[PDB]
């Protein structure tokens, strides 16, 4: 009742868009599009969005909107797969631990960019080496190809270590930046005025303005003409191979943030009679448009750098933090007034990270609150938020150590790759195959006011589970040990990452022991029949909305 509602649908749309658009749309998508064929890769991309992304997004949004309960509540349909919700928390923990750290790094790149002359531009500093031949050097990759930005990142932002067990003194600037980031998130998420409602306006709109300013500065007369023909070229003969289709499906699934407790949490707070069908296609379209726009803004300046360096664009191209912190800044430093575009870029990165961390902390907080929901624990939601924030800050300290980025990449690659796919597959199977497709269809028709579109039904029953199984199989078949620029992680890392992935994957089958022998456990067929039929509680979480068929 007093859980609160959005009050304005624009608020929900903006918060959801801010969560959907993450840092992946900045570095992961442009390089993937460049590497995976060429400008034709959009055809495997958007088609997947039509058949994989939008249906799953609609499923999650309708699930949350009708359930009117958090990450754990939505699973009151079958009180056996509730552990899936538990898993949806655990992954939401891991990302929430290693997302802020990235923000932390970006935060350290924000204040350091307020100086008159950029610190990662000139090789006259005392942390340089003999291999600092940079472009702005007026006064062994191939021969000495170590740009000053990479040197600054490797030697001053965090002193990289050789092994993984080498843990030196913690990086004090990174500790301070992580503390500032966590404090900002908590102070915004106080719910004293709103559940980050009227503060998600700026954090969800300003990144678009910054991207627009960057685009106008990057498509002016700079020589960045052969910087878009390498991103908008018709390499049609690279759509036959299954690898590009698998990568497109993976990007569609991971970029949209499906099935880790993000969409469900803020879909729960929605009013019941909300056109969630309109509220899913719109957000998916904005996410894809943002990815496309980022594919232009970065690559324009990358082509400018390629022209100024006398090399082709393929020489300068990175997939993750390499593009964010050492490739893009080394190109931004060459503009006539650099520490304004650099400031805008880092501010936009901070805003994009916050747009997702807000939702992650909301998901964890609302799950914890709704699990033990009484008139006591709803009165002190802010205290729970403070406790979870301090726990996240304390747990994230080792990731700002000398070997922080190794563990960051390990957690990114392992802890939230298999578990997401498995969780989504299990939820998709259970929702319309264990509970029933027709019951869910009439349930959706109850809330939307119209039957679901004739295409979404056949996409839910057939196309979406098949695509999820396909991406699972492609992930299983395509696997290589996680490696840095040049480093092979020993067992101390691969085994640990496997254990972290299992700590979320196995969370589902471990719930099967909570169904004790009291629930008619013997005669296994009867026990399976029970503990999965919806109880007297599942349904709309309000009165005057029973509509006869629910609780006469
Ligand atoms: C594999 N991952 C897991 C997970 C995906 C891809 C989510 C995190 N990532 C990228 C990322 C964050 C920090 C990193 F250090 C690196 Cl390497 C990558 C997002 O972009 C994102 C997506 N949504 C919906 C919100 N954020």
UniProtKB/Swiss-Prot annotation:
GO molecular function, one term: glycine transmembrane transporter activity
Residue spans, topological domain Extracellular: 112-169
One Gene Ontology term, aspect cellular component: dense core granule
Bilayer-spanning residue ranges: 12-32, 39-59, 91-111, 170-190, 199-219, 244-264, 291-311, 334-354, 390-410, 414-434, 454-474, 494-514
Ranges in a coiled coil: none
Subunit structure: Interacts with EXOC1; interaction increases the transporter capacity of SLC6A9 probably by promoting its insertion into the cell membrane. Interacts with EXOC3 and EXOC4.
Cellular compartment(s): Cell membrane
Keyword Transit peptide: no
Organism: Homo sapiens
Principal place of residence: membrane
Source species, domain of life: Eukaryota
Function summary: Sodium- and chloride-dependent glycine transporter. Essential for regulating glycine concentrations at inhibitory glycinergic synapses.
Protein name: Sodium- and chloride-dependent glycine transporter 1
Biological process, per Gene Ontology: glycine import across plasma membrane; glycine secretion, neurotransmission; glycine transport; neurotransmitter uptake; positive regulation of heme biosynthetic process; positive regulation of hemoglobin biosynthetic process; regulation of synaptic transmission, glycinergic; sodium ion transmembrane transport
Family assignment from sequence similarity: Belongs to the sodium:neurotransmitter symporter (SNF) (TC 2.A.22) family. SLC6A9 subfamily.
Included range, full protein: 98 to 668 of 706
Keywords: Amino-acid transport, Cell membrane, Disease variant, Membrane, Neurotransmitter transport, Phosphoprotein, Symport, Transmembrane, Transmembrane helix, Transport
The keyword Phosphoprotein belongs to this UniProt entry's keyword annotation: yes
